[PDB]
Amino acid sequence: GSHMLREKSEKFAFQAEVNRMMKLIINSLYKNKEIFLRELISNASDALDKIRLISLTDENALAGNEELTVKIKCDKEKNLLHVTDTGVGMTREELVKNLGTIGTSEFLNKMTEAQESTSELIGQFGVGFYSAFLVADKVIVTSKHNNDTQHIWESDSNEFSVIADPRGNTLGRGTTITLVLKEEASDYLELDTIKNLVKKYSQFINFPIYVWSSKTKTVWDWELMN
Ligand SMILES: CCNC(=O)[C@H]1O[C@@H](n2cnc3c(N)ncnc32)[C@H](O)[C@@H]1O
Numbered sequence: 001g002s003h004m005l006r007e008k009s010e011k012f013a014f015q016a017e018v019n020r021m022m023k024l025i026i027n028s029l030y031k032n033k034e035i036f037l038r039e040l041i042s043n044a045s046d047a048l049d050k051i052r053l054i055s056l057t058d059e060n061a062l063a064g065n066e067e068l069t070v071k072i073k074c075d076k077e078k079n080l081l082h083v084t085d086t087g088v089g090m091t092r093e094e095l096v097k098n099l100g101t102i103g104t105s106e107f108l109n110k111m112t113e114a115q116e117s118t119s120e121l122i123g124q125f126g127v128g129f130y131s132a133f134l135v136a137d138k139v140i141v142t143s144k145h146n147n148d149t150q151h152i153w154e155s156d157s158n159e160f161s162v163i164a165d166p167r168g169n170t171l172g173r174g175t176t177i178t179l180v181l182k183e184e185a186s187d188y189l190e191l192d193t194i195k196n197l198v199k200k201y202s203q204f205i206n207f208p209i210y211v212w213s214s215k216t217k218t219v220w221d222w223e224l225m226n
Helices: 015-027 033-057 091-099 106-117 120-125 128-134 183-187 192-201
Strands: 070-075 079-083 136-144 151-155 160-164 174-181 208-216 219-224
Touching: 015 106, 015 128, 033 070, 033 079, 033 120, 033 174, 033 192, 070 183, 070 192, 091 128, 091 136, 091 151, 091 160, 106 120, 120 128, 128 136, 128 174, 174 183, 183 192, 192 208
Parallel strands: 070 208
Antiparallel strands: 070 079, 079 174, 136 151, 136 174, 151 160, 208 219
16 A cells, blocks of 8 residues: 555654763764764673573474574675674564664763763663664664564664665665764774774673684685674
8 A cells, every 4th residue: 555655654853862962972972973883782691681581481482593603794886784683573663663773861961961981871771773873874673583473673863763674674684784984984894994993892791792804715605703
């Protein structure tokens, strides 16, 4: 049908508090941008813990994807950086709610008072996802939860939209965070750069983290980072 598209029912606005949170995060972390990756990996780890917990009581939990991993790949020619986990994933409703709406009050005070380090505060609380906007002009979240069809969440920070993924169920289960890198954040397309950061931020992750890398004549394959 053409109703959903004709009435733009796929477009949403961010909650005021979220807009404020995004600015705070982007303003206070301007000097420590690389931490966006640590945060995305941390979120992936959490999603992996959730499905792991679900599998405990639900025997069919891991059906869509038996592995529990975090895989990262740089697409230098597309100017894209991908962080994929085979965690619990998110349903269409969760994409809207979990990423578009938000201890909120105290955090706003704590962050402001911390600006006027905050790297640890972003981690303690769970709003590190937004640090991605420090290096990306657009952030895309493709997700597949056991109880819904694969969906795509996209945003340039001025609004966000969620749509059914026309590519179908390609993830099996999990989430891929896709960053359309800012022109100045081109270094995150470099394998070694990503490797140094990934290896430096996966040391405390109990799940295996891989980076799609090359070896030498030149062959590509997943390389374990932790
Ligand atoms: C304030 C930003 N919102 C989130 O990071 C929330 O969104 C969802 N989320 C973010 N990244 C992932 C992920 N990789 N897998 C599953 N849920 C996620 C979780 O519910 C998080 O608590």
